Amino acid sequence: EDVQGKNCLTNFHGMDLTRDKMCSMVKKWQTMIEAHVDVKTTDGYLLRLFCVGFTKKRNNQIRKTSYAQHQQVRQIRKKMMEIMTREV
Amino acid sequence: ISIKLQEEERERRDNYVPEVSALDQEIIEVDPDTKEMLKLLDFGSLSNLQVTQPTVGMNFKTPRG
Amino acid sequence: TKKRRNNGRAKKGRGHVQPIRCTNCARCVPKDKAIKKFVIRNIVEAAAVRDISEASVFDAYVLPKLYVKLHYCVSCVIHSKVVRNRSREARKDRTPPPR
Amino acid sequence: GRMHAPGKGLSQSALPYRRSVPTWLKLTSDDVKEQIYKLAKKGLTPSQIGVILRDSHGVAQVRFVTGNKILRILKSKGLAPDLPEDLYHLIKKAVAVRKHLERNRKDKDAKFRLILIESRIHRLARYYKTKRVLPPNWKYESSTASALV
Amino acid sequence: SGALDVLQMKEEDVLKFLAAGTHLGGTNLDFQMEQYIYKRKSDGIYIINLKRTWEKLLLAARAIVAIENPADVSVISSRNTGQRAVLKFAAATGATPIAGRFTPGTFTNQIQAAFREPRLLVVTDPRADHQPLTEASYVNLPTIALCNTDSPLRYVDIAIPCNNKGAHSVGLMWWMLAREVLRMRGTISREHPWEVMPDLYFYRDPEEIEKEE
Amino acid sequence: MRAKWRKKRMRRLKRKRRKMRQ
Amino acid sequence: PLAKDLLHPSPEEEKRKHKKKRLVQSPNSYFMDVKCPGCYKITTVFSHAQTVVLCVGCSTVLCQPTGGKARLTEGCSFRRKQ
RNA sequence: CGCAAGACGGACCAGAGCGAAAGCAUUUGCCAAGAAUGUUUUCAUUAAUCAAGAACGAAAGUCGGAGGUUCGAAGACGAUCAGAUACCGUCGUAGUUCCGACCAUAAACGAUGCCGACCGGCGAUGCGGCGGCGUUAUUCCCAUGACCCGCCGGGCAGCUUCCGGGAAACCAAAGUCUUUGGGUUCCGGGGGGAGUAUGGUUGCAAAGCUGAAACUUAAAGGAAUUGACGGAAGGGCACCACC
RNA sequence: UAAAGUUGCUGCAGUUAAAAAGCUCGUAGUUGGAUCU
């Protein structure tokens, strides 16, 4: 955002995950719940935050899959949205 | 190779009996359900039987997939 | 005559399955009929791993992997030896090779 | 199976063997009749009346306490609707589907379902006309249906 | 038995069964072995009603006794867990043993070297002894089998419900069958315990004999 | 001959005949 | 198998069956006298009630309709009849 | 580093779900539906299948309107080849996209009409309901979620079986068939000619529906078996193979 | 004419040999649960 005295002063512009991490996190017997919010901080900085989560297999689970029903996914996504909006 | 001499020699070899029977001992564990089965058979008052406790959980199926 | 009870696909209980493009030839193949491989391979070969790890500015950087999804059509999957012909009895077998 | 669906569902009420008023039920036949009359005056159909008699008053089956069915009771007292409950609900559903279809004209599934509902309406109307519940001149129309609702 | 108190099950027999794990079946249940199971445990194991086990053992002993040529009964075991038990049963009772692999065509191929025409067939496990059982369906051969909860009952005429997986249980069941057959025959009495004991019929791992030598 | 190409030939013949009989 | 006595089913097997496939069909539902500590009278509630029942002597919810059996509010004593 | 446009919704995504079929996959909201389960609610035979008739119906195609990123019939070149009017490559029109009106055809397939009953077993899975040790979250109690173990009802399927059937392949239906009759619709009668000619009808067209005959022919064809062959795969051998 | 159960009402076929309409709705037609000495 500025340069003084052979010195570049950077500001936060965005955040991301490396492709390897996101590729590893997507397995084939669970659901991926994805949410996003356009939210402005208290100083005019309007961000877009993306949250991703995956359903968890229990430690005593025998069923191969760990799928959440559509209403459960919607509740999880609404919780994601509200928590991210609160925290931002 | 099979001759009668080998058969008799092997039946001599298998003519082995332990001092104490491996079957009957002082205390044998028995689960509550088999204890009820025995009490149905009127053999539930045997004192050789030790009522052990059943498995804590219900994890006996291997995970599928 | 019928070679396979499932017709070489997994289209049970629906009428249409969306198609995908073969990674090799770009042929249109139904997503349930295409042969799917998920290859998770180290981004550097087992030969270049020594030089790359020696030249790393970090200690125990652990190289990232590469997660590629390949969707072969039947012709390309047979040519690439990803799957091969089986005897009439052994065709029914559905357990993946042990590898 | 279902008339207009491929389903072969089995769920339904399983009546008990006994045809007698239950021991817990102290309500007399006239008391049940009065409760039915009040519920009908409140504007409830025989299905709803039976539901709330079973659910709050312990009346397992009104026929086994009164000796008469709820619709027959309402007809005898004289406060039964002009057209039967099932036909009225079918006509209401058809009216709702038609009102949806006017603002959503690309909904071919709605058109298919409306055709099915109107076939059911016509079958029920033909049955009630043979049984003389409906006048022989009664016909279902695409314009006067909302008036009957 | 037939409610004959001389044939009723004894406390010592119950203790032998419980010590050998005879009452303990598997985690799977063949639908034709439902009538022999008392109840499933908290860990998925099926418990075998030992009263029905004794009833079927006595029925099998009665069937064996009603063959006045003892060599016309064939006792078969393909698994090692029951080979010594089968040999001991054949020695004590006079039956003909087939311990080891059963050659197909033994009952059907008249020309073969091991061709025989038994009058009754007893096997340790219908799953592991499926080959003689099938041949039993070719020569009018009645069949007795020691059946676990998941045992298949095809071509099995008298199914004895017992644990046939453990060496202790297999040996004890064969020993008890030999004891019952002898008692019905007349040799050895029903009053004092048999001078032979189940551990003779058991199977010992080669490491066990190495430990014992 | 492939049946669909025989059908195509027949349809082209029918079009040529339609041009014949206007 | 091949000898099942269809005239005298065991009560456990008959209770295991669907309510319509029993020898003589019987419902799985029941009626309960339910009583609240804040009430001076009992009421009769269907086990599978489809409406929200209220206390006869109060204004409190008694049971909430669900997919199957209704959810009786805690603190209310319920006893089956017959 | 941005901006614009149009297209499409990866991975999750499954022999999983929903829909009459065609078909349906970013979030959120609205709208009207729907199956299944639950039901000691209501009506009380109101039902099954159906000439006529009607709704929907992939893709391509046809009219107008908008758009027009990619891909791309036709087409223009460049290659390869004996020749290539193809396969391969660079471009590229219609089209592919949306709106309205047509078209009503697909290997529109489960190549298997719908409704009903009976006839083996097993383990899974989806939805609903019921019951129950125990673990985990909502800081702790019940409820409820996620698991675990069963049961019931419909559903997509799978394995197994000397149920039975079948020419067999195979099918728990394609079984309950010379021991032949539960109800009903459609439809076939050796192969070609030929789904052609012709008439009728529908369509703006392309074509759709209905649809022969003369003539010709001893076989076409189904399933399976043994060989031979393969510019199919996998093994094995040999200095008349190689290293 | 029989053979021809190759016209099948008795009495045929329609997964692959010829063949179930792409799919539902629907009138006529055909068929229609228990029950009354």
Side-chain angles (χ1 to χ4, degrees):
Chain A
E1 291 257 313
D2 190 290
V3 47
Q4 333 195 351
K6 218 76 53 158
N7 224 317
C8 320
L9 311 171
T10 52
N11 192 4
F12 173 82
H13 190 56
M15 197 255 312
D16 229 313
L17 298 176
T18 64
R19 180 172 323 264
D20 41 277
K21 190 58 196 322
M22 245 306 267
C23 270
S24 57
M25 271 154 29
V26 189
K27 283 96 164 179
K28 211 169 104 78
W29 306 117
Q30 75 216 37
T31 110
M32 170 183 39
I33 300 104
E34 262 179 353
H36 68 77
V37 270
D38 307 36
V39 46
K40 194 193 60 88
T41 59
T42 63
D43 41 341
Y45 263 113
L46 165 84
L47 318 178
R48 170 129 79 223
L49 280 96
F50 299 91
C51 175
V52 69
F54 304 86
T55 61
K56 207 193 194 340
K57 168 158 207 185
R58 295 318 232 168
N59 32 62
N60 64 294
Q61 200 181 282
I62 303 314
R63 286 147 49 66
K64 186 185 66 190
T65 54
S66 67
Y67 296 134
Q69 313 194 99
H70 179 62
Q71 288 317 308
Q72 299 190 333
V73 171
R74 295 168 45 87
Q75 312 169 342
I76 295 165
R77 177 179 295 114
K78 192 148 135 284
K79 260 285 170 296
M80 281 169 180
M81 249 159 204
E82 72 169 80
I83 290 176
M84 263 186 329
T85 289
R86 187 184 75 239
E87 304 284 86
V88 175
Chain B
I1 307 307
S2 300
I3 326 97
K4 169 273 308 152
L5 187 68
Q6 289 164 353
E7 261 184 11
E8 274 56 356
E9 177 68 17
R10 286 176 51 214
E11 84 90 22
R12 220 55 55 65
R13 281 176 254 181
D14 289 26
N15 181 33
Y16 163 69
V17 206
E19 164 179 0
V20 208
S21 191
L23 223 57
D24 290 336
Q25 312 269 302
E26 281 185 300
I27 286 296
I28 58 200
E29 268 101 317
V30 130
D31 294 52
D33 292 8
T34 144
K35 178 114 195 170
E36 301 312 292
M37 181 210 110
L38 297 170
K39 86 142 199 283
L40 248 65
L41 180 43
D42 298 317
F43 290 115
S45 30
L46 294 163
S47 209
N48 269 351
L49 282 36
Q50 163 193 129
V51 194
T52 190
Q53 284 284 62
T55 17
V56 207
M58 258 162 150
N59 295 350
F60 60 95
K61 291 301 188 194
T62 180
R64 286 173 298 241
Chain C
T1 189
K2 277 197 73 172
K3 198 176 198 177
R4 290 171 201 81
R5 163 143 180 154
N6 66 346
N7 313 319
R9 47 183 320 165
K11 199 199 69 57
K12 295 279 188 25
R14 54 211 49 94
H16 189 245
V17 175
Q18 60 261 93
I20 54 190
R21 302 312 281 280
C22 181
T23 53
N24 217 56
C25 49
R27 174 167 229 274
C28 264
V29 48
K31 179 170 138 123
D32 69 354
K33 187 183 180 110
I35 288 83
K36 271 104 77 197
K37 281 230 145 263
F38 198 31
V39 40
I40 302 107
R41 43 193 263 251
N42 269 301
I43 217 158
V44 319
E45 42 187 7
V49 70
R50 221 253 174 270
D51 301 298
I52 264 64
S53 280
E54 175 204 8
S56 196
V57 290
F58 310 107
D59 285 323
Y61 163 68
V62 52
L63 305 318
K65 324 214 73 181
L66 196 58
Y67 301 77
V68 183
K69 320 117 199 194
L70 318 153
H71 302 160
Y72 308 95
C73 77
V74 173
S75 323
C76 274
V77 76
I78 289 175
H79 184 80
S80 295
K81 275 128 185 171
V82 180
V83 296
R84 74 185 38 51
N85 89 304
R86 303 197 284 183
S87 35
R88 162 172 264 197
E89 175 80 293
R91 282 203 255 269
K92 316 154 134 291
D93 195 359
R94 284 178 70 98
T95 173
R99 191 188 63 190
Chain D
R2 296 294 84 71
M3 165 175 289
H4 280 155
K8 320 239 159 292
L10 183 59
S11 69
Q12 69 210 102
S13 290
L15 223 56
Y17 181 83
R18 53 101 183 242
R19 301 176 194 178
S20 61
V21 46
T23 56
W24 73 78
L25 187 52
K26 315 300 175 64
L27 279 153
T28 36
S29 149
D30 264 21
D31 271 336
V32 184
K33 268 154 195 289
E34 291 293 312
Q35 198 58 239
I36 290 166
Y37 294 163
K38 155 150 100 173
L39 290 178
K41 287 165 161 222
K42 194 178 311 309
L44 281 94
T45 35
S47 307
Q48 303 181 281
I49 292 163
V51 163
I52 37 182
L53 279 199
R54 191 207 41 202
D55 270 352
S56 302
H57 295 93
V59 183
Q61 215 76 38
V62 187
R63 198 170 29 105
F64 295 143
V65 183
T66 278
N68 254 280
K69 316 164 66 73
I70 304 189
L71 207 241
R72 221 169 299 221
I73 283 159
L74 296 185
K75 274 134 154 283
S76 107
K77 178 80 163 202
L79 74 174
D82 291 327
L83 82 176
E85 180 215 305
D86 39 357
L87 185 53
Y88 160 93
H89 276 109
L90 272 165
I91 292 176
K92 208 200 62 55
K93 187 188 302 161
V95 154
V97 174
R98 247 153 200 286
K99 178 191 154 202
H100 164 91
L101 259 164
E102 95 209 348
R103 29 186 180 151
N104 300 105
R105 263 209 64 270
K106 279 283 272 319
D107 202 325
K108 316 271 185 48
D109 184 36
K111 215 219 278 218
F112 181 78
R113 297 316 155 156
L114 179 73
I115 291 172
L116 300 189
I117 298 160
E118 259 148 16
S119 299
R120 245 134 56 214
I121 288 174
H122 285 106
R123 286 155 95 127
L124 207 43
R126 157 173 89 225
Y127 160 64
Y128 280 132
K129 278 200 272 199
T130 70
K131 278 269 140 40
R132 263 193 308 300
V133 172
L134 300 179
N137 52 69
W138 194 98
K139 84 282 211 171
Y140 174 74
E141 298 152 282
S142 297
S143 56
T144 44
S146 49
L148 309 147
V149 167
Chain E
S1 104
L4 299 186
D5 318 336
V6 73
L7 292 180
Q8 254 39 66
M9 182 173 161
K10 259 30 144 163
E11 289 97 353
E12 49 140 307
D13 300 329
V14 184
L15 292 159
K16 290 189 167 89
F17 282 144
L18 295 152
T22 291
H23 64 300
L24 292 168
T27 36
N28 313 324
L29 185 66
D30 195 73
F31 77 110
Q32 263 144 4
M33 287 277 285
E34 241 286 330
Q35 77 185 312
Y36 297 124
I37 273 48
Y38 168 67
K39 190 190 127 113
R40 196 172 200 210
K41 273 155 76 173
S42 292
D43 65 323
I45 294 282
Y46 278 102
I47 302 170
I48 295 171
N49 200 268
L50 288 174
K51 225 262 190 173
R52 315 249 64 216
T53 307
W54 188 255
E55 224 49 81
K56 296 314 293 284
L57 187 89
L58 284 191
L59 185 60
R62 284 176 185 246
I64 289 161
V65 169
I67 291 136
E68 71 168 58
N69 184 5
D72 260 351
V73 185
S74 209
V75 279
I76 322 284
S77 197
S78 313
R79 283 161 63 196
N80 52 24
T81 216
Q83 264 161 265
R84 194 188 176 201
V86 153
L87 296 155
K88 288 323 178 260
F89 182 103
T93 324
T96 311
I98 301 191
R101 161 206 172 62
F102 183 83
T103 287
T106 289
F107 299 154
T108 326
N109 198 0
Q110 333 99 51
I111 257 71
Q112 278 194 26
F115 175 65
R116 77 212 37 211
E117 298 156 84
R119 268 172 49 83
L120 183 96
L121 191 77
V122 195
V123 299
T124 306
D125 185 10
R127 233 171 250 284
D129 271 86
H130 70 91
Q131 185 54 56
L133 253 55
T134 306
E135 304 217 2
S137 59
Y138 284 81
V139 280
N140 316 93
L141 202 44
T143 293
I144 307 176
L146 308 177
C147 295
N148 216 318
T149 62
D150 42 38
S151 261
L153 257 45
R154 181 191 249 132
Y155 298 138
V156 172
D157 282 79
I158 297 168
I160 302 175
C162 63
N163 176 16
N164 66 338
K165 267 206 46 43
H168 282 352
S169 288
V170 170
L172 166 73
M173 294 298 310
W174 279 102
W175 171 84
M176 278 222 189
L177 186 55
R179 195 180 71 169
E180 299 321 309
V181 175
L182 297 171
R183 273 163 182 194
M184 260 150 213
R185 275 227 260 280
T187 134
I188 85 155
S189 96
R190 331 203 54 123
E191 286 100 65
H192 34 285
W194 193 17
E195 324 76 36
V196 200
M197 77 192 231
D199 305 42
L200 185 66
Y201 288 47
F202 289 0
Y203 160 79
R204 319 108 77 180
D205 40 74
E207 66 114 346
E208 269 190 35
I209 306 103
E210 283 162 49
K211 192 180 292 298
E212 290 286 75
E213 272 186 348
Chain F
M1 179 168 225
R2 184 155 173 189
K4 89 187 325 194
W5 305 145
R6 193 169 10 211
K7 184 139 101 159
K8 204 165 180 74
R9 263 145 86 107
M10 263 150 44
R11 279 178 176 153
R12 302 222 155 129
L13 260 178
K14 213 140 144 209
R15 251 187 274 201
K16 149 87 199 83
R17 276 202 267 284
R18 261 176 287 195
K19 279 327 83 171
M20 273 154 50
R21 195 172 63 176
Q22 331 210 34
Chain G
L2 253 75
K4 216 161 280 255
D5 208 315
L6 323 161
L7 256 166
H8 299 290
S10 93
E12 40 286 60
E13 214 83 272
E14 204 77 345
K15 162 115 183 293
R16 214 217 209 181
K17 269 162 200 335
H18 192 264
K19 51 172 191 176
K20 281 281 185 167
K21 319 202 171 177
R22 290 176 182 141
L23 204 70
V24 172
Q25 55 192 268
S26 34
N28 298 330
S29 56
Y30 49 91
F31 287 76
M32 308 153 321
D33 316 303
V34 86
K35 167 64 172 79
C36 163
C39 202
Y40 73 111
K41 297 187 318 301
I42 57 102
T43 87
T44 331
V45 182
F46 193 39
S47 49
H48 295 77
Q50 309 156 8
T51 140
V52 206
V53 188
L54 310 174
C55 299
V56 61
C58 172
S59 62
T60 324
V61 317
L62 221 47
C63 73
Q64 301 254 10
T66 67
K69 249 174 256 197
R71 214 153 56 210
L72 325 163
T73 204
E74 262 72 49
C76 273
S77 60
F78 88 84
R79 72 188 70 267
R80 295 185 55 163
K81 302 310 324 283
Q82 300 212 280

